[PDB]
Amino acid sequence: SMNPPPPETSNPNKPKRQTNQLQYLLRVVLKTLWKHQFAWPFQQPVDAVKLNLPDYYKIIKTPMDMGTIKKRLENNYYWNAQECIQDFNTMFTNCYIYNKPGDDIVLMAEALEKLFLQKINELPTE
Ligand SMILES: Cc1ccc(NC(=O)c2ccc3c(c2)N(C2CCCC2)[C@H](C)C(=O)N3C)c(C)c1
């Protein structure tokens, strides 16, 4: 029921960048979402051995989670806010793909996605 390696949080041959939008994504968006009552399933990579989901990575080929995103933001791994936003969207979409409408985990993702969209609706200007 193997777990693949978690997504990279550093890559020396990829250029780094810091922007006002990226700082905001860490300080306000991620750190606020992190505290939500429904955030806990999304704070680390899915552990298929722990959670007894041997087929998780049979289905999900581009895993993403907020722990990974947090480390990426802390590393200045991203070039721009859009790249980070893409990771959040991958995380939510993975959840919808792996599960089914109405599942408790999906209700959690739906709630977080709404809050996420609420917070990125307006970003700082650079
Ligand atoms: C309702 C719920 C919420 C969390 C957990 N415990 C997790 O470790 C956990 C972390 C992340 C996920 C997850 C479980 N589900 C499970 C649960 C939903 C049906 C499959 C699937 C793989 C998913 O897509 N994600 C993101 C449990 C046991 C039940």
Side-chain angles (χ1 to χ4, degrees), residues 1-17 19-36 38-49 51-81 83-99 101-126:
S1 138
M2 251 140 300
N3 293 316
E8 67 184 16
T9 56
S10 66
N11 185 324
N13 282 326
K14 188 181 186 291
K16 296 188 171 189
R17 206 159 70 134
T19 69
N20 292 333
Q21 297 193 350
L22 281 163
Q23 295 181 276
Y24 180 84
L25 276 175
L26 179 58
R27 176 184 72 88
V28 174
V29 181
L30 186 150
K31 286 179 183 184
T32 307
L33 256 54
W34 193 271
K35 297 179 167 60
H36 194 280
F38 295 162
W40 59 265
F42 305 96
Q43 291 172 343
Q44 59 287 311
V46 171
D47 187 326
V49 176
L51 311 195
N52 318 132
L53 300 149
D55 70 344
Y56 187 83
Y57 295 107
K58 295 186 187 308
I59 296 293
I60 299 300
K61 302 305 181 186
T62 58
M64 186 55 54
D65 65 279
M66 293 202 295
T68 298
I69 297 170
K70 187 171 180 294
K71 293 173 180 176
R72 287 181 170 191
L73 285 163
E74 291 171 343
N75 181 254
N76 302 309
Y77 174 88
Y78 298 113
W79 182 256
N80 65 18
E83 189 184 351
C84 174
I85 290 163
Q86 268 228 105
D87 277 351
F88 275 98
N89 287 325
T90 295
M91 177 180 78
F92 295 128
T93 290
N94 285 349
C95 182
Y96 306 142
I97 289 168
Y98 180 71
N99 298 285
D103 287 353
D104 276 353
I105 191 65
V106 167
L107 301 178
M108 297 174 89
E110 288 166 351
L112 295 169
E113 187 187 0
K114 281 182 201 177
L115 183 53
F116 174 68
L117 287 172
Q118 196 170 89
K119 293 175 184 316
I120 68 158
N121 180 92
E122 194 169 74
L123 300 173
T125 53
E126 168 105 323

